[PDB]
Scaffold this motif. Structure first.
Motif, PDB file in Angstrom:
ATOM      1  N   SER A 177      38.925 -17.374  21.387  1.00  0.00           N
ATOM      2  CA  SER A 177      39.580 -18.253  20.942  1.00  0.00           C
ATOM      3  C   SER A 177      39.345 -19.456  22.204  1.00  0.00           C
ATOM      4  O   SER A 177      38.522 -20.830  21.839  1.00  0.00           O
ATOM      5  CB  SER A 177      40.489 -18.538  20.398  1.00  0.00           C
ATOM      6  N   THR A 178      39.516 -18.858  23.208  1.00  0.00           N
ATOM      7  CA  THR A 178      38.903 -19.718  24.553  1.00  0.00           C
ATOM      8  C   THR A 178      37.649 -20.716  24.222  1.00  0.00           C
ATOM      9  O   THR A 178      37.394 -21.661  24.744  1.00  0.00           O
ATOM     10  CB  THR A 178      39.449 -19.309  26.105  1.00  0.00           C
ATOM     11  N   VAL A 179      36.816 -19.802  24.263  1.00  0.00           N
ATOM     12  CA  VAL A 179      35.206 -20.077  23.637  1.00  0.00           C
ATOM     13  C   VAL A 179      34.615 -19.336  22.156  1.00  0.00           C
ATOM     14  O   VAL A 179      34.441 -18.615  21.993  1.00  0.00           O
ATOM     15  CB  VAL A 179      34.258 -19.438  24.704  1.00  0.00           C
ATOM     16  N   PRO A 229      39.368 -31.360  22.283  1.00  0.00           N
ATOM     17  CA  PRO A 229      40.780 -31.926  22.988  1.00  0.00           C
ATOM     18  C   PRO A 229      41.530 -31.095  23.978  1.00  0.00           C
ATOM     19  O   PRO A 229      41.617 -30.670  24.480  1.00  0.00           O
ATOM     20  CB  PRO A 229      41.351 -33.059  22.148  1.00  0.00           C
ATOM     21  N   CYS A 230      40.804 -29.762  22.893  1.00  0.00           N
ATOM     22  CA  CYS A 230      41.827 -28.162  22.857  1.00  0.00           C
ATOM     23  C   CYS A 230      40.968 -28.161  24.422  1.00  0.00           C
ATOM     24  O   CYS A 230      41.843 -27.395  25.464  1.00  0.00           O
ATOM     25  CB  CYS A 230      41.821 -27.471  21.955  1.00  0.00           C
ATOM     26  N   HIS A 231      39.871 -28.491  24.543  1.00  0.00           N
ATOM     27  CA  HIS A 231      39.430 -27.677  26.382  1.00  0.00           C
ATOM     28  C   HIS A 231      39.476 -28.444  27.205  1.00  0.00           C
ATOM     29  O   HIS A 231      39.691 -28.048  28.385  1.00  0.00           O
ATOM     30  CB  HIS A 231      37.586 -27.389  26.072  1.00  0.00           C
ATOM     31  N   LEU A 232      39.822 -30.024  27.203  1.00  0.00           N
ATOM     32  CA  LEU A 232      39.851 -30.736  27.744  1.00  0.00           C
ATOM     33  C   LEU A 232      41.233 -29.924  28.490  1.00  0.00           C
ATOM     34  O   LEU A 232      41.557 -30.750  29.673  1.00  0.00           O
ATOM     35  CB  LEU A 232      40.120 -32.109  27.277  1.00  0.00           C
ATOM     36  N   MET A 244      30.909 -27.316  35.170  1.00  0.00           N
ATOM     37  CA  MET A 244      29.919 -26.793  34.705  1.00  0.00           C
ATOM     38  C   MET A 244      29.890 -25.475  34.381  1.00  0.00           C
ATOM     39  O   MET A 244      30.494 -24.700  34.840  1.00  0.00           O
ATOM     40  CB  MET A 244      29.102 -27.320  35.449  1.00  0.00           C
ATOM     41  N   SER A 245      29.106 -25.179  33.315  1.00  0.00           N
ATOM     42  CA  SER A 245      28.513 -23.117  32.966  1.00  0.00           C
ATOM     43  C   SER A 245      27.457 -23.034  32.314  1.00  0.00           C
ATOM     44  O   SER A 245      26.479 -24.633  32.123  1.00  0.00           O
ATOM     45  CB  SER A 245      29.950 -23.087  31.132  1.00  0.00           C
ATOM     46  N   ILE A 246      27.200 -21.932  32.796  1.00  0.00           N
ATOM     47  CA  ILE A 246      25.796 -21.809  32.753  1.00  0.00           C
ATOM     48  C   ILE A 246      25.404 -20.432  32.138  1.00  0.00           C
ATOM     49  O   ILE A 246      26.325 -19.844  31.924  1.00  0.00           O
ATOM     50  CB  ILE A 246      24.402 -21.677  34.573  1.00  0.00           C
TER      51      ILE A 246
HETATM   52  C1  LIG Z   1      41.307 -24.995  20.962  1.00  0.00           C
HETATM   53  C2  LIG Z   1      42.605 -24.245  20.402  1.00  0.00           C
HETATM   54  C3  LIG Z   1      40.771 -23.664  22.021  1.00  0.00           C
HETATM   55  C4  LIG Z   1      38.969 -23.852  22.864  1.00  0.00           C
HETATM   56  C5  LIG Z   1      38.222 -24.398  22.138  1.00  0.00           C
HETATM   57  C6  LIG Z   1      36.863 -24.958  22.905  1.00  0.00           C
HETATM   58  N1  LIG Z   1      36.722 -24.046  24.143  1.00  0.00           N
HETATM   59  C7  LIG Z   1      35.288 -24.682  24.509  1.00  0.00           C
HETATM   60  C8  LIG Z   1      34.885 -24.760  25.795  1.00  0.00           C
HETATM   61  C9  LIG Z   1      35.197 -23.280  26.787  1.00  0.00           C
HETATM   62  N2  LIG Z   1      35.956 -22.479  26.808  1.00  0.00           N
HETATM   63  C10 LIG Z   1      35.919 -21.938  28.313  1.00  0.00           C
HETATM   64  C11 LIG Z   1      36.686 -21.200  28.509  1.00  0.00           C
HETATM   65  C12 LIG Z   1      36.876 -20.427  30.128  1.00  0.00           C
HETATM   66  N3  LIG Z   1      36.931 -21.556  30.554  1.00  0.00           N
HETATM   67  C13 LIG Z   1      37.396 -20.296  32.280  1.00  0.00           C
HETATM   68  O1  LIG Z   1      37.789 -21.086  33.052  1.00  0.00           O
HETATM   69  C14 LIG Z   1      38.166 -19.618  31.438  1.00  0.00           C
HETATM   70  C15 LIG Z   1      39.270 -18.373  32.561  1.00  0.00           C
HETATM   71  C16 LIG Z   1      39.699 -19.446  33.842  1.00  0.00           C
HETATM   72  C17 LIG Z   1      37.987 -19.002  30.353  1.00  0.00           C
HETATM   73  C18 LIG Z   1      38.682 -18.224  29.640  1.00  0.00           C
HETATM   74  C19 LIG Z   1      34.095 -22.494  29.046  1.00  0.00           C
HETATM   75  C20 LIG Z   1      33.773 -21.932  30.550  1.00  0.00           C
HETATM   76  C21 LIG Z   1      33.623 -23.418  28.209  1.00  0.00           C
HETATM   77  C22 LIG Z   1      32.539 -24.251  28.512  1.00  0.00           C
HETATM   78  C23 LIG Z   1      33.095 -25.683  28.931  1.00  0.00           C
HETATM   79  C24 LIG Z   1      32.468 -25.459  29.710  1.00  0.00           C
HETATM   80  O2  LIG Z   1      32.147 -25.505  30.968  1.00  0.00           O
HETATM   81  O3  LIG Z   1      33.912 -25.761  30.293  1.00  0.00           O
HETATM   82  C25 LIG Z   1      35.157 -25.464  23.278  1.00  0.00           C
HETATM   83  C26 LIG Z   1      34.100 -26.169  23.550  1.00  0.00           C
HETATM   84  C27 LIG Z   1      34.068 -27.761  24.259  1.00  0.00           C
HETATM   85  C28 LIG Z   1      32.430 -27.693  24.655  1.00  0.00           C
HETATM   86  O4  LIG Z   1      32.858 -29.008  24.212  1.00  0.00           O
HETATM   87  O5  LIG Z   1      31.445 -28.230  25.633  1.00  0.00           O
HETATM   88  C29 LIG Z   1      36.109 -25.572  22.662  1.00  0.00           C
HETATM   89  C30 LIG Z   1      35.846 -26.316  20.964  1.00  0.00           C
HETATM   90  N4  LIG Z   1      39.492 -23.241  23.758  1.00  0.00           N
HETATM   91  C31 LIG Z   1      41.150 -22.437  23.965  1.00  0.00           C
HETATM   92  O6  LIG Z   1      41.939 -22.270  24.562  1.00  0.00           O
HETATM   93  C32 LIG Z   1      42.171 -23.099  22.106  1.00  0.00           C
HETATM   94  C33 LIG Z   1      42.100 -21.564  21.871  1.00  0.00           C
END
Ligand SMILES: *[C@H](C)[C@H]1/C(=C/c2[nH]c(/C=C3N=C(/C=C4\NC(=O)C(CC)=C4C)C(C)=C\3CCC(=O)O)c(CCC(=O)O)c2C)NC(=O)[C@@H]1C
Length: 291
Positions: A177-179, A229-232, A244-246
């Motif tokens: 769910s995190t990604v 907003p969830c990710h923010l 930043m993610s690659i």
């Molecule tokens: C929302 C309820 C759920 C959710 C959604 C969500 N996540 C992303 C994007 C990313 N999530 C991460 C996850 C991690 N980053 C880390 O540093 C760690 C370890 C500490 C994890 C597990 C990552 C890397 C991304 C990519 C974006 C980035 O580089 O930061 C999205 C997409 C957002 C976008 O526009 O790219 C969405 C919708 N995340 C949750 O935790 C909820 C369960």
């Protein structure tokens, strides 16, 4: 809806190169008005050399993405631009040439060195540790991690390099769910995602209705697209305001991510993102032989 992050400009051209859409921050960065550009020809707005580069790049209608184009206007100065074809429109995205003193530059030497170091890594574990350390040298991010995906799309931080002051995330597991599946899909299409400031006020694109498909403008391919907003909130809870993610791609499959975090807002220009992209390709190829 229909908004981008403010660190750049988005102009949207129709298949014939007429300006049909734009982000509301165009007067603030260029000087020209949004309404004084909608319906205008690209031949009038861009200089002869820029219009030539644009025409040449768009002459192949199969080409979905383009190498950085120097974008100069007739009322100019030069922006670094990226174009993408999506939803029957040509998205031209501009990074301002105004470099910040805190932002990194001169990626070539550090990238050549990173690749030299990466090749010498003996195991999958030591190649991911070197990739994290090397990406941190190239970028200056506070913490760089290798987040590997498991079959159920849950991940584990298998590698990490960071500033001593920042906390560790090494070994931690997180749900799928995190990604989510739709974020993961866009990473197999566009390999680098940037969020320079999690506290950004979104900049809208007017009109937010596509003048060809009828349907509103799909910005899922734009580099500057807005963040859920969830990710923010997820990022705010861990105290990192710049990310930043690659993607690490094994064919079209997402093996993992090179995750970069910064305590304060942080930006890596197109040159450094392309440099990181190369490092991720070298790393994916080595993962492939070592697997
Ligand atoms: C929302 C309820 C759920 C959710 C959604 C969500 N996540 C992303 C994007 C990313 N999530 C991460 C996850 C991690 N980053 C880390 O540093 C760690 C370890 C500490 C994890 C597990 C990552 C890397 C991304 C990519 C974006 C980035 O580089 O930061 C999205 C997409 C957002 C976008 O526009 O790219 C969405 C919708 N995340 C949750 O935790 C909820 C369960």
């Amino acid at each position: 809806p229909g908004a981008i992050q403010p660190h750049g400009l988005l102009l949207a051209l129709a298949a014939d190169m007429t300006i049909v859409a734009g982000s509301d921050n165009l007067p603030e960065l260029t000087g020209l008005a949004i309404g004084a550009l909608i319906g205008r020809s690209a031949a009038d707005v861009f200089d002869s050399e820029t219009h030539n580069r644009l025409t040449i790049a768009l002459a192949e209608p199969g080409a979905a993405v383009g190498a950085p184009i120097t974008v100069g206007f007739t009322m100019r100065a030069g922006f670094i631009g990226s174009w993408h074809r999506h939803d029957q429109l040509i998205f031209l995205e501009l990074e301002p040439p105004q470099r910040d003193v805190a932002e990194p530059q001169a990626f070539f030497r550090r990238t050549r060195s990173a690749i030299r170091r990466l090749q010498a890594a003996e195991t999958l574990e030591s190649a991911c540790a070197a990739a994290a350390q090397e990406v941190r040298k190239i970028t200056g991010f506070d913490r760089v991690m290798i987040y590997r995906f498991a079959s159920d799309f849950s991940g584990e931080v298998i590698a990490e390099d960071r500033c001593a002051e920042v906390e560790s995330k090494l070994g931690l597991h997180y749900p799928a769910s995190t990604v989510p599946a739709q974020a993961r899909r866009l990473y197999t299409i566009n390999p680098v995602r940037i969020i320079p400031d999690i506290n950004y006020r979104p900049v809208p694109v007017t009109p937010d209705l596509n003048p060809v498909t009828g349907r509103p403008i799909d910005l899922s391919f734009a580099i500057l697209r807005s963040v859920s907003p969830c990710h923010l909130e997820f990022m705010r809870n861990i105290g990192m305001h710049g990310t930043m993610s690659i993607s690490i791609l094994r064919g079209e499959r997402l093996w993992g991510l090179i995750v970069c975090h910064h305590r304060t807002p942080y930006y890596v220009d197109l040159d450094g993102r392309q440099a990181c992209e190369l490092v991720a390709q070298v790393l994916a190829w080595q993962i492939g032989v070592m697997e």
